[PDB]
Amino acid sequence: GGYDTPLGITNPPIDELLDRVSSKYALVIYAAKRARQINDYYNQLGEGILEYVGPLVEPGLQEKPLSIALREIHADLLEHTEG
Template identity: 55%
Template sequence: MSEKLEGIVSPAIDNLLNKVDSKYELVIFASKRARQINDYYSALHEGSLFNNVGPLVDATVDEKPLTIAMHEIDQNKLQKHATE
């Protein structure tokens, strides 16, 4: 059986941690983006998409917003901004 493992295995956690300063920053960064993706999908059902940005990577219906956010981080589709 050669199943393709998904979730935290893909993208690899080591690759994700190289893109941020700490694992805590990764959690916050990914969770904020996942909330934005979730808001996008909610707005999609309501018919108003003007305030929300959808997934920046190819995503299937089965993927959770957090998984999509992790793929966006891994593919350098997102940039973190320094907080003031």
């Protein structure tokens, strides 16, 4: 599009995030299941050996795992199947 850069909670733009998914009800579960995996990786790295994967993209200074999950989704780095 011909928009200016979004700021804060409107990044990434949702009209492009919705082109990778079937509807707006599956994006919620997609992001909310990636965020739990990221948090588990963070909370299991300092204790023992785990099986999950860390953030596939470079994080910021203090970023919520939901933002990292959405940035990974927008970059076409994940894949999912529907029940």
